[PDB]
Structure 1
Amino acid sequence: KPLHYPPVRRDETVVDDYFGVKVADPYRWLEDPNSEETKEFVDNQEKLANSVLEECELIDKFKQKIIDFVNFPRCGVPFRRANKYFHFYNSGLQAQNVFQMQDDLDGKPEVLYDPNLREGGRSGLSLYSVSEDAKYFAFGIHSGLTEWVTIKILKTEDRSYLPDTLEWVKFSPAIWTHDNKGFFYCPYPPLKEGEDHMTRSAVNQEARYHFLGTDQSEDILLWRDLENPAHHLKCQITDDGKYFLLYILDGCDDANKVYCLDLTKLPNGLESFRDSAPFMKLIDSFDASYTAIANDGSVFTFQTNKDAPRKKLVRVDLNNPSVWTDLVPESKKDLLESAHAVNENQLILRYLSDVKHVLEIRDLESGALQHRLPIDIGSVDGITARRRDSVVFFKFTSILTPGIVYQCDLKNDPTQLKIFRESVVPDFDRSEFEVKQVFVPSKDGTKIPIFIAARKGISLDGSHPCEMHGYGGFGINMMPTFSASRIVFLKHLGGVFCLANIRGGGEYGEEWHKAGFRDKKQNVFDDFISAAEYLISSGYTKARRVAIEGGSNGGLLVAACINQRPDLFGCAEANCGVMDMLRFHKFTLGYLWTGDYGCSDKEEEFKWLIKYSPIHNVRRPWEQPGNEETQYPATMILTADHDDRVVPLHSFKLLATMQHVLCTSLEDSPQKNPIIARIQRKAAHYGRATMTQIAEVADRYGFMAKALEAPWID
């Protein structure tokens, strides 16, 4: 059916000079989220979207089949405080997960906090910190539509609220001191009047200590740096309770400083401060990443990438800090992803080996190997066991494995794994499908690992719809994990799924990351294109039956790839993508990503950014000689109206630009395939209700089945 693309005003005033190169930005006005015109733009694109989505008949069958496939209990990985175990639970279709509590392992669960009983379950919990004595539960809620968090505190004895209320938190955890008196957290300064969380670029993050029973204005300032407003914070406390550790970060880089405060050495408590705090600055530069794993007095075991792309464990005494020793040296082939001190004197290491996990248990003091459990295609994650804990829990998942919380009692039954909880998916035969790993040459010959999931014994004749996922940035490892949606794609649309472990990720250590960032960011798109070409050439699928999907930096990936190779894809779905690479740093926490992208402030970096910036590279493919029959694929640009993480102007400005260049700028365009935006109302980036999510994925796959001309199978 023909589309009626709504009028979007162009402003030819807006020209900007990037080192002599003139760049026109006619949809500058869309950067204002709260204007008459921008709200009418959102309204118009919602109408256009709803008109196209009404023609996608399969949305309703997807939605009902997702709802059924997802209606099973899901369990979070439990953690211990005192004799209490706490975990997240969801019976299957509850809008938000419920936080549960129990006395010891045998104990029966009870509800500690149910977000479904507050504001109808629109917001779930972001922060969830139980104190050392298990008497206090600090928890974070989204008080507005943005993802900014309000810390509140509860007595676990009887669910009664404390008066304490702490605003202006984002990703900070609440780190309790062993005296149960309060906790360290890392807030931003308050909003002055006029300001908004969508329009303010939050800087000058602080390290605070909050005492229980006080107003936030009484919280003790430990650190801040007004001379470096972009520097951001993470923090931690050692398991013995003696050291507060402050990690300072430059941007999105896997690198940090390490500042240690000895809590035993302060006369008059943390009330001592009122003057910044006497940190021992063990690392005062951004050369390498460092994460404390354990300590015995001043003798610290860190995970690091210092002269070690695949990471390693090292030891240092804060009284003799120039002398560092390798405890567990760098592997020659496999990434040390995480390390966790457990069972007093043991050490669990998670290794990533060709995108498959291997768990090692080692002696803490010596570093000697004891056991080694390789794990199947899938992921192991969520190890939250502390050093004093003797039972270790982890979540396992894969493409065909819904989710198993495993349990290892290292003290009393060390070799066995017990299933704490196993989620079973209804109406799904896993043996009918298989998952293979395959390595594919890229444009420069680099072998890129690919996971391909499909029905066993499909003929490779290019008949099948193919859905391909990828990210390619920020050191993120992309693991094959369970999505119920995807099972519905595989089973009821005869689909083939592909997770491509492209460069920019951290799958083969920091060399893999740096091969797809800054000047070499193009390699990431080349890798993804090359993997799409393999699925076609090996015979799973064809040019116009391939669908690509991604979120945030993955949205950038999808937008970049369809600009460069529109012929290769039949559907493009970019979730909250970073589409204006010239101006991303100007909005919210976007300045943090300059470590991976560069910044248009510098001329060298502008020169590589301008070449792939999605909004600046939308070109009519049919106008290229010998490319006449090519058009852009059917495109859905997903975003929320109140995403403060990746601001929606990115998605809006791309959508406006595409709809102009391809459709409304000429009389009768070859562009037939729809170019729409699904804009979710009163949502943020993540943390949305179960049905809000299901509705979005239902629309995704319905649009996809229409674009790829894929029929339903009962």
Structure 2
Amino acid sequence: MDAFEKVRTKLYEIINVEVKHGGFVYYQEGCCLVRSKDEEADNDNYEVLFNLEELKLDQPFIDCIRVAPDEKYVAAKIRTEDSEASTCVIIKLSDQPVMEASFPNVSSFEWVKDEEDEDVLFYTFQRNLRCHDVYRATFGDNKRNERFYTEKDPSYFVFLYLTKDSRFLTINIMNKTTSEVWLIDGLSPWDPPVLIQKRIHGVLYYVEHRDDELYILTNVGEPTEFKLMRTAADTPAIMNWDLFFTMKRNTKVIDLDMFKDHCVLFLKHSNLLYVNVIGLADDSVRSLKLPPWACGFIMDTNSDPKNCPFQLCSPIRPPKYYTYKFAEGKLFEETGHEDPITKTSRVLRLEAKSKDGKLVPMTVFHKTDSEDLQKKPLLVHVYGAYGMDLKMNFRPERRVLVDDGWILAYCHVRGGGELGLQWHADGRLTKKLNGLADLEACIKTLHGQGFSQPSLTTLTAFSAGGVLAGALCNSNPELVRAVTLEAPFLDVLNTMMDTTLPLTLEELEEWGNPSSDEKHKNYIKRYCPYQNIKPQHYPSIHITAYENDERVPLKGIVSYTEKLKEAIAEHAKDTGEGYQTPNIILDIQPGGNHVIEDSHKKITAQIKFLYEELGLDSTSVFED
């Protein structure tokens, strides 16, 4: 399971942390862990549990909260900004909440309802970035900790997960391609763990339990195909797994909600998304009727044993709440609370014809009442690397564009994982030219199909997406008028061969090692924007660069801006007489973005830059 909801959550702007357990809602209200009633009376009525200063950290916030079944203790992950370490703090919930422990560097942790009626904490951390340990901490008779597992492979992550029925605690040793799951008896955690199946290189599997039967999500036999399997808890060996549900090729399992008698499975195939309820005992398999305007889920990894809440969203419509009303027959729209985004939107799944003849899916969607004769500005998105899908979350800075007539395009080029591993195998450093072979063809297919013209075509990118952005500026700059870049990545070769002190763990497997390979010099020099900067006419650029960033060198892009200005000046000096030099802006912003306001006002700086290079008046009336 590649981008699974439990995997990606343990794999821009801050997110809230709000765990509801036992009639109380745990969160921080001013760097101070509190607990309020199930439905808050006032925004000020809450019980103070732990103040975050008592750790002497800089800008600490809650990462996740896990509550003991007895509620006698609460574990919280304290993680700060502009740092790398964290701390899992444990507070005793008595008539005077006090801290009794604080373990650092803890990745994941879960509580275990113990047969001896004692809250048992399981947690995991790395010893000198070398390998993971799993301990057991109790706080009643002060049994201290107990290492009972030690994964010895540094290349393997280790995360804990509790089955919804709390029957088993899964110790999940994981790799990008290989996994291995152990089981802790939820009815006696002190028993040694049980290995389900020794890892098999290439075989991923994730284990959920229901009623004495282990339901196992795996791609055994074929990595491109995922599938659900069952086995008895007494016989969990791989030779005892029977197929139970078959998924299409290259589907993306993005969540699995196990229930007392069925199993809900949230999937994504191509750009289409599906959810279907699978009967455990019976053969019930019904695929729910999804609305066409939806382009992505918003999952909440907390659910009751008889209802399946989920949430649909697109880059234009705010998230809409849903639930498989289990005992009934699935409700949807909460009350009548709905936005008329659908009244005029045009969510269109389209395909592009790349130069090497492969269908490239791209999602375009705009107002339908917009008269057809005129053409409105087009803003396309791209990433096409790391196997990541292009994010379809709701962005308020995009609704205001479509409301003003804009045309939005989401180009899911190769390098991403929309069409599976096959899509990600292509568009990597050895074949990144395919990423351009799709991004260029996507824009051309839009123009050929009469959507917008290069005078009104723009694009935005982000970090790794800036590679295909700057390359297109040196490949075919006649297709774009303006470009906005957010912490972009331009001189890939002058960052990698210049191996002063870059960690570069996964970047080698994505962008090949150029400092010790000839083939990893020729091909990377073909598309690296810094190496194909030729003095020509360019689109306008607005870079909202962050000074404090380790994935993006400030030198690597500040040097790109000046070299870009020297290149256009040489092209200017050649034909400097009405050439109209493009405006190139670099808005250096210090530190990671602290509040929602600064990022949402750099939004305004990006939108105003686009409306300047096109001159489309100004419609910036909106909330935040």
Give the TM-score, by structure 1 length: 0.70
CA deviations on 1:362-415 (whole Å, 9 max, x unpaired) are 1135664145333432222314246x721221122124421223233314x343
Is 1:145 matched up with 2:82?
Answer: yes
Change (3 A) 1:246 1:410: same
CA contact under 8 A between 1:327 and 1:367: conserved in structure 2?
no
The match for 2:390 among 478, 483, 490 is 478
Deviation at 1:136, TM superposition (A): 4.2
Change (3 A) 1:137 1:471: farther
Query: Which residue in the other structure is 1:415 paired with?
Result: 330
CA contact under 8 A between 1:77 and 1:382: conserved in structure 2?
no
Which AA in structure 1 matches 2:598?
T
CA deviations on 1:575-633 (whole Å, 9 max, x unpaired) are 2334443455967774124443333345444443333333333332x2xxxxxxxx222
CA contact under 8 A between 2:542 and 2:587: conserved in structure 1?
yes
Query: Which residue in the other structure is 2:440 paired with?
Result: 529
Alignment of 1:353-368 (within 5 A): 353-365=269-281, 368=284
Deviation at 1:360, TM superposition (A): 0.3
In 2, the alpha carbon distance for the partners of 1:487 and 1:283 equals 49
Query: Which residue in the other structure is 1:234 paired with?
Result: 159
Which AA in structure 2 matches 1:292?
V
SS in 2 for 1:497: strand
Query: Which residue in the other structure is 2:264 paired with?
Result: 348
CA deviations on 1:93-145 (whole Å, 9 max, x unpaired) are x9999998654x999997679999999x9765433333444554433344342
Deviation at 1:263, TM superposition (A): 4.5
In 2, the alpha carbon distance for the partners of 1:279 and 1:238 equals 15
CA contact under 8 A between 2:119 and 2:139: conserved in structure 1?
no
Query: Which residue in the other structure is 2:538 paired with?
Result: 632
Query: Which residue in the other structure is 1:207 paired with?
Result: 133
Change (3 A) 1:95 1:560: farther
Change (3 A) 1:368 1:224: same
SS in 1 for 2:369: coil
Deviation at 1:340, TM superposition (A): 1.8
SS in 2 for 1:513: helix
Is 1:507 matched up with 2:507?
Answer: no
The match for 2:362 among 450, 472, 475 is 450
Identity %: 17
Query: Which residue in the other structure is 1:199 paired with?
Result: none
Query: Which residue in the other structure is 2:476 paired with?
Result: 565
Which AA in structure 1 matches 2:219?
T
In 2, the alpha carbon distance for the partners of 1:529 and 1:453 equals 19
Is 1:248 matched up with 2:174?
Answer: yes
Change (3 A) 1:281 1:369: closer
SS in 1 for 2:319: strand
Deviation at 1:348, TM superposition (A): 0.6
Query: Which residue in the other structure is 1:710 paired with?
Result: 616
Query: Which residue in the other structure is 1:21 paired with?
Result: none
In 1, the alpha carbon distance for the partners of 2:311 and 2:196 equals 35
Query: Which residue in the other structure is 2:105 paired with?
Result: 168
In 2, the alpha carbon distance for the partners of 1:205 and 1:113 equals 36
Query: Which residue in the other structure is 1:200 paired with?
Result: none
CA contact under 8 A between 2:274 and 2:287: conserved in structure 1?
no
CA contact under 8 A between 2:49 and 2:97: conserved in structure 1?
no
SS in 1 for 2:238: strand
In 2, the alpha carbon distance for the partners of 1:139 and 1:348 equals 29
Is 1:294 matched up with 2:209?
Answer: yes
Query: Which residue in the other structure is 1:307 paired with?
Result: 222
In 1, the alpha carbon distance for the partners of 2:219 and 2:69 equals 28
In 2, the alpha carbon distance for the partners of 1:182 and 1:593 equals 39
SS in 1 for 2:505: helix
SS in 1 for 2:549: coil
CA contact under 8 A between 1:559 and 1:574: conserved in structure 2?
no
**How many pairs does the alignment contain?**
588
CA deviations on 1:423-458 (whole Å, 9 max, x unpaired) are x77xx8663443323222122222222222222233
Alignment of 1:550-629 (within 5 A): 550-582=461-493, 583=495, 590-600=504-514, 601-620=516-535, 622=536
CA contact under 8 A between 2:262 and 2:278: conserved in structure 1?
yes
In 2, the alpha carbon distance for the partners of 1:421 and 1:650 equals 50
- Runs of 5+ unmatched residues, structure 1: 1-69, 191-202, 271-277, 623-630
Query: Which residue in the other structure is 1:196 paired with?
Result: none
In 1, the alpha carbon distance for the partners of 2:468 and 2:407 equals 20
CA contact under 8 A between 2:160 and 2:169: conserved in structure 1?
no
Change (3 A) 1:157 1:632: farther
CA contact under 8 A between 1:77 and 1:393: conserved in structure 2?
no
Deviation at 1:533, TM superposition (A): 1.8
In 2, the alpha carbon distance for the partners of 1:461 and 1:149 equals 57
In 2, the alpha carbon distance for the partners of 1:545 and 1:114 equals 55
In 2, the alpha carbon distance for the partners of 1:391 and 1:86 equals 19
Deviation at 1:695, TM superposition (A): 1.7
Query: Which residue in the other structure is 1:58 paired with?
Result: none
CA contact under 8 A between 2:181 and 2:206: conserved in structure 1?
no
Change (3 A) 1:321 1:439: closer
In 2, the alpha carbon distance for the partners of 1:79 and 1:356 equals 31
Deviation at 1:88, TM superposition (A): 8.1
Question: Which one is further off, 317-326 or 360-369?
Answer: 317-326
CA contact under 8 A between 1:303 and 1:339: conserved in structure 2?
no
The match for 1:677 among 559, 569, 586 is 586
In 2, the alpha carbon distance for the partners of 1:96 and 1:543 equals 49
CA contact under 8 A between 1:84 and 1:134: conserved in structure 2?
no
Change (3 A) 1:417 1:491: closer
Which AA in structure 1 matches 2:159?
K
In 2, the alpha carbon distance for the partners of 1:280 and 1:313 equals 19
Deviation at 1:558, TM superposition (A): 1.9
RMSD: 4.4
CA contact under 8 A between 2:79 and 2:87: conserved in structure 1?
yes
In 2, the alpha carbon distance for the partners of 1:603 and 1:279 equals 47
The match for 1:397 among 307, 313, 317 is 313
SS in 2 for 1:681: coil
Deviation at 1:683, TM superposition (A): 0.9
Is 1:435 matched up with 2:370?
Answer: no
Query: Which residue in the other structure is 1:14 paired with?
Result: none
The match for 1:321 among 231, 238, 243 is 238
Give the TM-score, by structure 2 length: 0.79
SS in 2 for 1:701: helix
Which AA in structure 2 matches 1:237?
L
Alignment of 1:456-471 (within 5 A): 456-460=368-372, 463-471=375-383
Deviation at 1:173, TM superposition (A): 3.3
Query: Which residue in the other structure is 2:8 paired with?
Result: none
In 2, the alpha carbon distance for the partners of 1:608 and 1:310 equals 31
Query: Which residue in the other structure is 1:222 paired with?
Result: 149
Question: Which one is further off, 641-650 or 664-673?
Answer: 664-673
Deviation at 1:221, TM superposition (A): 7.2
Query: Which residue in the other structure is 1:128 paired with?
Result: 65
Change (3 A) 1:75 1:656: closer
The match for 1:260 among 182, 186, 196 is 182
In 2, the alpha carbon distance for the partners of 1:651 and 1:279 equals 50
Deviation at 1:467, TM superposition (A): 1.0
SS in 1 for 2:530: helix
SS in 1 for 2:80: coil
SS in 1 for 2:301: coil
Deviation at 1:504, TM superposition (A): 2.4
Is 1:496 matched up with 2:410?
Answer: no
CA contact under 8 A between 2:257 and 2:308: conserved in structure 1?
no
CA deviations on 1:181-224 (whole Å, 9 max, x unpaired) are 4544443456xxxxxxxxxxxx4252343626699x96737324
Question: Which one is further off, 494-503 or 279-288?
Answer: 279-288
